[PDB]
Amino acid sequence: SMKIDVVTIFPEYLQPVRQSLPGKAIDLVDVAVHDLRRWTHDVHKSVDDSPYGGGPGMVMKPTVWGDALDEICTSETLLVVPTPAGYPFTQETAWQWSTEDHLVIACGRYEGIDQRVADDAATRMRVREVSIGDYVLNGGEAAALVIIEAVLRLVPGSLLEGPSYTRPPSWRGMDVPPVLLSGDHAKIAAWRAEQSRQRTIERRPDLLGFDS
């Protein structure tokens, strides 16, 4: 079943852990992590350089990424490039990728990878540039972990959730809502619906088609 390759200059940060949702799956999926510097040939193992046209920071070189993806990818590969400028990664995306035979995730710095890498790959395989949110990360590594977790839990083998409770029924003078103790499946369903409504309207009005 599914193969996931992750390419990064911080392979220890990805390093698959038994005691993980992904770790259990590994013990249905195979996850391999590759050090990008493996495909460098200068003594300094240089993966980036200053941007053409100017600007702050560095851009990852196309040469190294090309050699790396040449080796790892096939025409059947779905190449995932986490980036702040990507299409939104959503739950629909997770379901779609959950049926893929082979995901390769290219982790780069925020400033990004030379655009020609994605352009070149697209001539040979499917390429998806995606953002997991509008906060700013220093690199794609944490995004890769999020994507893997969201995808792996869907592999064979709307409205916000309201508040949940468990035992004891009273705790620090705070009681569980009595309807939840009443065993009335209908009243419980109605209460839960109303709680989710209040919470969605308050926290995520966008989900119900309202202004933010």
Q: What is the 3-state secondary structure (H, E, C) of the chain?
A: CCEEEEEECCHHHHCCCCCCHHHHHHCCCEEEEEEHHHHCCCCCCCCEECCCCCCCCCEECHHHHHHHHHHHCCCCCEEEEEEEEEEECCHHHHHHHCCCCEEEEECCECCCECHHHHHHHCCCCEEEEEECCCCCCCECHHHHHHHHHHHHCCCCCCCCCCCCCCCCCEECCEECCHHHHCCCHHHHHHHHHHHHHHHHHHHCHHHHCCCC
CB of 78 to its own copies, least distance (A): 16
Residue 205 binds its own copies (CB under 8 A): no
Among 3, 78, 86, 201, binds its own copies (CB under 8 A): 86
Residue 90 binds its own copies (CB under 8 A): yes
Taking CB atoms, the residue at the shortest distance from ligand JBQ is 82
Select the binding partner of residue 122 from its own copies, ligand JBQ, none (C-beta < 5 to 8 A, by kind). Answer: none
Kindly state the number of chain residues that form the binding site for its own copies, as judged by CB under 8 A: 82
Select 1 or 138, whichever has its Cβ closest to ligand JBQ: 138
Residue 169 binds its own copies (CB under 8 A): yes
Select 42 or 92, whichever has its Cβ closest to ligand JBQ: 92
Q: What would the x/- binding string for its own copies be over residues 22 to 61, using CB under 8 A?
A: --------------------------xxxxxxxx--xxxx
